[PDB]
Design a protein around this nucleic acid. Structure first.
Ligand code: ZN
Ligand code: ZN
Lengths: 553, 553
RNA sequence: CUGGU
RNA sequence: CUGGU
C-alpha cells in the first residue's frame, strides 16, 4: 500500500445502477479485486419468455485471477440469485476463492448452488457475522455492519482502502422495531464519519419518499388486525425472501388458532432454509396443502406466491388457470402483503379483479397497511448523510429519478458533498484522496435466462419478437426454377395490408423472373424481393411488418 | 304508459361496466329506446397497433328504429369519442334522431364528426342546458343536473320512467370550488330521493378511496406554487379533455409573465373549441411553438400531450425520439399534471427517467399535489347514497374491485338497498317497481380501430400476434413434387429449439414423402407436417411456437 | 381514465 | 423490488 497522485480505487458497477435489481459492484486497488454481491434481475417491460436476468461479467472473466474475495450483503435474489450462473462463468464448477456471507446468506446460496448441479463444498463459502471485520488481499479492510431490511442477516459495509474510507450502506431502512429484534448498528458508520468519509454509496430506492418507512412491527399489528377479523380461510402473498413478513403472518395465524400451509416453490425454498437455521420460529409446523384441506375455514391460513400477479404463481392459479385443491371459494380472505412493482401494476390489478369476482375479500395497501418497503425514506437517508458527511457521493440501488433526488437531498444538507455522480452499469469511476470521476467503460449488459438455460433467449430473438407483435409477418415463398411460383401468406397483419397481399405476389414474381434471367444466386434474389415489398407496404399502410422471403431452387 | 307485473324498464350497458372507458348504456321501455353516451376506450394491456376501442352496437343496429334520442352527459373521449364510428354504423352518414348535449359536448362532437368526412348538419344535434328537463318518446322524462368533473358542462341525469325513478350520477366529484365556478346541482337529486329512488347508477371510480377528492382550485394553487418557483422553461402535460386543468395552467403562466404555446393535436382540438365557445379564458393568446422559440426561458410555458408516456406524444418526442424545435435543455421544468393509469405506469416511469437524465426538473404527484382525480371519493359517494337512498343499486364506471367496494359502501349505510348488482357489458337488467335482476345477454364486445380504419385489427390478428411474441415462429416450406425439398427457418425462436431445426426438416420430409405416395391434396399434407412438429417441440423445449407449414406443388 | 414525427 | 401446472 501507498499514496499520492498514482494511488486510486476503481469502482465498477456491473449491475444495480440506474435500476433496482442485479446488484454487483467491483472494487479495485492495484492488482487486487473484491466483488460486492452477485445479483439477479426480473423482467416485464416488453420481454416475453425471459424468466431471469443476470449481469455481463466480461470484466470478471478477464480478471478472474485478481479476485481476492466475493462479499455478500444479503440472501435476497437481487443480491445472490445471479451467482449459480456467474460463478461457473468466472471460475468453473469449483473455486478456492473466499465467498463471505452471513448464516442465512450462505445458507440460501448453498441451496441455490446445490439445485444447479453444483456442490457447496466445491466453493469456499466462509461464514461471517453481519457486524464482522474482514481483510481482503493487502489493500481492503471490510467493516460489515448490521442494517434492517426485508430479509434477516442484511449488512452494510465500511470499505477501508489505502486512500480513504468508502461507506456502503447496503439495502437498508432504519427500522426501530424489527421482527427478529436485531436493530441497525450505526456505531461503525458514526465512527467512519468522524474519521472522515471519502465516498458514500447509498440505497436510493425511496429518495423521493418523504418521512420514515414504517416498521415491520407496525405491519405485523395491521396483519394481526385483518387476520383476526377474517371469517373463513386466509390467503397471504408476499415476496419469497421476506422472512420477517412471513414471521408476522405465522404469528397472526398462531394467535387466532390457524394452521399455516405453504404453496409456491420460491417461498418454500427460502422458508425451508430459514426454519432450519433458526430464522423462522413456528410454534406448531408448516402443514401441507393436502392436510389443511379437511380442516374448517377459520382454522386455515395458506401462505403463497403471486403478489405481483405472475402468470404461473399460486395466486394466479387460484384466480385464473386453476389449482389441484385450491379454488377461490366465496367468503375467502386474500391479503396481498406487498405492493405492485412499476410495470407489473396491471398484472396485479387483473388478478385482484378476478379474485373479487370469486367472492373473496381482497385486502391490500393503501386501504390496509399490510406492506412496508424495506428501503429507507428521506428522514432515514438524511440521518445517514449527516452521520457520514461524505466528500463524494454515489447514489445506488435506484433509477435515474431516484438517484437525482438523493443528489438533491445530499445538496440540501448543511455540508453537501464536493461532487455527486449518477452511477451507470459498466462505468469505471476513479477515486483518489481529492478526486472522483468517470474514466472509461467496460463490456457490460445483461444475459436472458429461462428453464432451458442461460442465453437461450438473446437480444435478437426479443428484437424481432417485437416486430411480429408490433407490425406482423409477411411470408413470401419464391421458387427459383424454370416455372417460377410466388405464394405470399400472413399472420397478425392489418386487414388493409391483407387486401394488398395479391399485389405482393405480382411484386415478387417480377423480381423472381429477373433473378433467373440474370442467373443471380438465391441470396441475391431474396434482396430483390425484400426491399421493394418493404417500401411498398410502408407507402400503402404505414406499417413495417416482418417480411420473410423464402427462396427455393 | 301503464303499470303492474308486465311493465318494466330494461337497462343494457354496451360499454362502461367492469371497466372505466367506452361508456354507453341502453334504456328501454316497451317499443322505445334512449341511449346514454357513445364512448371510446384506450388500449395498453397486451394489444399492439390498436389506437382506439369502440363498443359493439349490434343491439342498436338491429333496433335502429326504436331509438328515440341520444343523450350525452359530457364531451370527454370516453363519453363522445366512439360516436363518429357508432353513428354511421347505426344510422348512416345522416340521421334525423335527436342528439342532446351541452354547448361544449356538441361543440366537441361537431369537430369530431366534421373531421371524419361527415357534416354536423346531417345529424340532429340539439343543444340543452346541463340542468335541462327533456322528454324522450312517451315514456322517458330526463332531468339533467350539473355535476363537477374534469371537463366543463358535465351532467348527471334523473331518469323518470312509468315504473319509478332512476338516478344516474354521471361522471362526478363534489368539488366545492370548481375552476369555472359552476358547482354541482344537488336539488333534483335531493328532490328525487324524497319522492323515492328505484335505482341509482353511480360513478364507482374511487369507491376504494377514503375521504374527499381535492378541488381543482387546490391543484391550481399548487401549480401556481411550482410554476412561480421554476427557473427556466415550463412544460405541462395533462389529459387533453381537462379544460379546467388547462385553465389553471394558463392562469399560472399569465400570473408569472409567461406565454403559453400548444403542441399535441388531441389537446389542440379540445382547446380550439373550448376557447371559441368561451370555456377557456386567455388574457393574451395561445402562441405557436415557432413564435415562443426566440423568447427567453422564464417567459416560456409549453402545454403539451404525453402525461401517460404515449409513444408518439410531445413529451415522449421531447424525451426519446426527437422534435423539430423542442429539445429538453438542462434546467427545464416538466410538470406531469396527471397520474399514471394502471397499465401505463412503466411508460410514464421510462419517460420520467429519460427526462431527468436530460437536466430537467420533473414534478408530479404525490410529491407535488399537481393532479386530482375527477371522480368522487368515499365521503362524496356516501353523501349521494344518503341523498338518494335507492331501493336497488347498480355501480358503474369502474372495474369489479371498484364495483364491489361501492356495493359494501352502500351496505354500510343506515338504509342499504334491497339488492345491488355488479354491472357487466352486454347484460340485460329487468327493472320493475319491486324487482331488479339479470334476464339475459345481447351480442357485445369491442372493435379495434387504427389510422387505417375501424376493424383493421381483429381479435385473431392480436391472438396470433401474442403467439409470435410469447413463443416465436417456425416456417416450414415443403415442395409437394417429384423431388421433395423441405426448408425450415425461424424468427424469435429459443436457441434450444433453433438447435432442433435440423430434425424438423427430417420430420416434415417424412410427412411429404407419405403425402405424395398416397397422392393426398396439399391441404392434407400441411396437417401431416403441422401436428407431429407441434408435439415434438412441446416435448423437447416445452414451448408452443407458431408453426407455419407452407406447401407448394 | 389516456394518443396521433 | 418480483416467479417456476
Ligand atoms: Zn436489494
Ligand atoms: Zn368518464
Amino acid at each position: 500500500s501507498q499514496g499520492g497522485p498514482q494511488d486510486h480505487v476503481e469502482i465498477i458497477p456491473l449491475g444495480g445502477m440506474g435500476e433496482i435489481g442485479k446488484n454487483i459492484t467491483v472494487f479495485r486497488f492495484r492488482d487486487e479485486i473484491f466483488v460486492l454481491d452477485g445479483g439477479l434481475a426480473f423482467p416485464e417491460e416488453g420481454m416475453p419468455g425471459v424468466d431471469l436476468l443476470i449481469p455481463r461479467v466480461d470484466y470478471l472473466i478477464e480478471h478472474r485471477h485478481k479476485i481476492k474475495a466475493w462479499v455478500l450483503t444479503h440472501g435476497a435474489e437481487d443480491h445472490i440469485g445471479g451467482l449459480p450462473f456467474l460463478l461457473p462463468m468466472i471460475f468453473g464448477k469449483e473455486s478456492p476463492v473466499p465467498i463471505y456471507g452471513a448464516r442465512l446468506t450462505l445458507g440460501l446460496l448453498r441451496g441455490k448452488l446445490e439445485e444447479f448441479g453444483l456442490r457447496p463444498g466445491a466453493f469456499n463459502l466462509k461464514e461471517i457475522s453481519p457486524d464482522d471485520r474482514i481483510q481482503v488481499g493487502r489493500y481492503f479492510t471490510l467493516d460489515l455492519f448490521r442494517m434492517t431490511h426485508s430479509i434477516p442477516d442484511n449488512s452494510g459495509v465500511v470499505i477501508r482502502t489505502p486512500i480513504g474510507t468508502i461507506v456502503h450502506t447496503g439495502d437498508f431502512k432504519l427500522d426501530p422495531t424489527p421482527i427478529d429484534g436485531k436493530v441497525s448498528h450505526l456505531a461503525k458508520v458514526a465512527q467512519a464519519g468522524a474519521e472522515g468519509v471519502l465516498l458514500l454509496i447509498a440505497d436510493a430506492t425511496n429518495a423521493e419518499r418523504p418521512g420514515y418507512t414504517p416498521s415491520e412491527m407496525e405491519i405485523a399489528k395491521e396483519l394481526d388486525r385483518v387476520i383476526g377479523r377474517a371469517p373463513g380461510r386466509v390467503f397471504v402473498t408476499t415476496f419469497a425472501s421476506h422472512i420477517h413478513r412471513i414471521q408476522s403472518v405465522i404469528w397472526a395465524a398462531e394467535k387466532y388458532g390457524r394452521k399455516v400451509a405453504m404453496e409456491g416453490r420460491s417461498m418454500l425454498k427460502f422458508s425451508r432454509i430459514a426454519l432450519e437455521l433458526g430464522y423462522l420460529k413456528v410454534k406448531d409446523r408448516l402443514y401441507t396443502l393436502e392436510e389443511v384441506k379437511d380442516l374448517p375455514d377459520h382454522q386455515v391460513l395458506i401462505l403463497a406466491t403471486g403478489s405481483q400477479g405472475q402468470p404461473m404463481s399460486v395466486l394466479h392459479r387460484l384466480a385464473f388457470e386453476g389449482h389441484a385443491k385450491m379454488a377461490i371459494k366465496p367468503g375467502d380472505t386474500v391479503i396481498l402483503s406487498s405492493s405492485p412493482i412499476p410495470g407489473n401494476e396491471e398484472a396485479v390489478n387483473r388478478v385482484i379483479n378476478r379474485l373479487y369476482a370469486l367472492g373473496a375479500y381482497v385486502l391490500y395497501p393503501p386501504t390496509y397497511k399490510v406492506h412496508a418497503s424495506g428501503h429507507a425514506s428521506q428522514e432515514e437517508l438524511k440521518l445517514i448523510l449527516n452521520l457520514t458527511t461524505p466528500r463524494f457521493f454515489l447514489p445506488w440501488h435506484g433509477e435515474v429519478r431516484h438517484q437525482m433526488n438523493f443528489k438533491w437531498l445530499a445538496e440540501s444538507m448543511s455540508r453537501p458533498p464536493e461532487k455527486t455522480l449518477i452511477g451507470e452499469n459498466g462505468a469505471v469511476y476513479r477515486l483518489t484522496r481529492e478526486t472522483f470521476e468517470k474514466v472509461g467503460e467496460v463490456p457490460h449488459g445483461v444475459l436472458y435466462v429461462d428453464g432451458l438455460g442461460v442465453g437461450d433467449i438473446t437480444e435478437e430473438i426479443l428484437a424481432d419478437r417485437r416486430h411480429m407483435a408490433e407490425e406482423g409477418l409477411v411470408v413470401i415463398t419464391a421458387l427459383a426454377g424454370e416455372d417460377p411460383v410466388v405464394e405470399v401468406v400472413s399472420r397478425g397483419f392489418v386487414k388493409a395490408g391483407e387486401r394488398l397481399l395479391g399485389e405482393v405476389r405480382r411484386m415478387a414474381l417480377e423480381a423472381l423472373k429477373n433473378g433467373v434471367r440474370e442467373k443471380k444466386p438465391l441470396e441475391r434474389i431474396r434482396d430483390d424481393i425484400y426491399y421493394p415489398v418493404k417500401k411498398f407496404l410502408k407507402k400503402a399502410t404505414g406499417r413495417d411488418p416482418m417480411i420473410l422471403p423464402v427462396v427455393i431452387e
